[PDB]
Design a protein around this ligand. Sequence first.
Ligand code: FAD
Ligand code: 7N6
Length: 456
Amino acid sequence: LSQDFVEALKAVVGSPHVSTASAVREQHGHDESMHRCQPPDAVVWPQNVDQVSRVASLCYNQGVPIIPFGTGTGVEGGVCAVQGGVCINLTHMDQITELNTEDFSVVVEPGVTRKALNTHLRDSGLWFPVDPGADASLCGMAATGASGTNAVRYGTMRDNVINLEVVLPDGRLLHTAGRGRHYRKSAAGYNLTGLFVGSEGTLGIITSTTLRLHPAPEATVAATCAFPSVQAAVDSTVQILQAAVPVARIEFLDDVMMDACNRHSKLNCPVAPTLFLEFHGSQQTLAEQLQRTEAITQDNGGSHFSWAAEKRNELWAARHNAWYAALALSPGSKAYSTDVCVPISRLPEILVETKEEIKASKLTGAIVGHVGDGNFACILLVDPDDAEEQRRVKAFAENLGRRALALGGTCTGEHGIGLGKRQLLQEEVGPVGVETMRQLKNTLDPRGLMNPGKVL
Ligand SMILES: Cc1cc2nc3c(=O)[nH]c(=O)nc-3n(C[C@H](O)[C@H](O)[C@H](O)COP(=O)(O)OP(=O)(O)OC[C@H]3O[C@@H](n4cnc5c(N)ncnc54)[C@H](O)[C@@H]3O)c2cc1C
Ligand SMILES: CCCC[C@@H](O)C(=O)O
């Protein structure tokens, strides 16, 4: 990367906001996944959208790859600079704007996390519900198509992103639904907002997101329920969903994950396949939701509910940190995560089969999951230096993905494709789906410089 080019970057964002130092690049060459660190050639921190546009145009016209970088908490290698180039760290644009509490909407820049937004919204009676366990950039969450424990009731990012501000690869500025617009529904033209949600930085750079806000629940009750078997816990989940109980949260932990979370959070739950549950409503609604849900869990051998503001906070903090709880089982290990999502009636088959397949392997695994969506993660620890173990973990994850595809499901419910699921995506949507996706990629990024090597 030439000295003239570096000086041109500094001319846009300022000398302190460009770095070619090896340590700084290495810190931006990886995410939380096991994918090998591939450092960009430079890291740049634009201070406003005009600077994002000018950095993108400079890179694009010089043939330099662009890698958008939020908080680096992704798990599929999205920020790995597989072809080098310029990593654009977006987090210095950190302003919340256009808060419209009467319309239940707000605009956030990439440096805003969900924690920051919900802190800014306390005493408003509103909150933003989509809750990945990591303190992630909300624009990064839009880019990956994230969900969370609350999505079963309140929707994923796709459900709650109403507009996006996107710097296209050559620097043009697009407001996907129109500048300043926010509304509940539209049939106006083609829906561009949904194309950029889940695009993982391969179609453009999200520089603001317009988010749907939700009313805080009148009353909240959380609980845990221990089961004799994985089958019993997942059967309960399916029956709760088929009974249309509007649960706010329904999260599965297998016994390995329960124990890991116990050790990492000083919860003391019975070591068993467990549901973490949360219910929102009035006192009257909660009582009948609880009655109908305990009746179903009881039918499948569930324990009486162990009830949980501060004890609920500890419960969900433990759940949100499950990834780190699993990593702490074998210190020094990295890990890969699966993320399949299947039609809910097939969820018992594939979860039970996954448990059995983990047991029959010398692989260690923990299972945790947004099972209310038919989604779960298998967390597979890896010795970073054991090449034979990594091959077995990859083979396991690929076979699980293919089993989900055989059941009519998807290889990723929320994490995305990045570097790890590109072959599974080709199987999932077939040749016409792949070509159509690639045609969209090519019209927005003709030179192939917008996060190359990812998704497609
Ligand atoms: C402990 C833990 C728990 C998690 N729980 C969940 C969960 O429940 N659900 C879930 O969905 N994910 C979860 N995640 C994964 C991760 O937090 C999400 O994928 C999150 O959306 C990533 O955001 P980020 O800004 O950190 O992404 P990064 O790693 O910085 O980037 C992810 C991808 O998006 C692109 N990108 C980032 N920002 C932008 C932008 N502004 N414009 C365009 N492209 C961009 C990058 O180029 C990359 O390809 C978890 C991660 C951890 C570590
Ligand atoms: C870190 C990614 C694996 C686990 C995450 O999806 C979660 O549900 O907490």
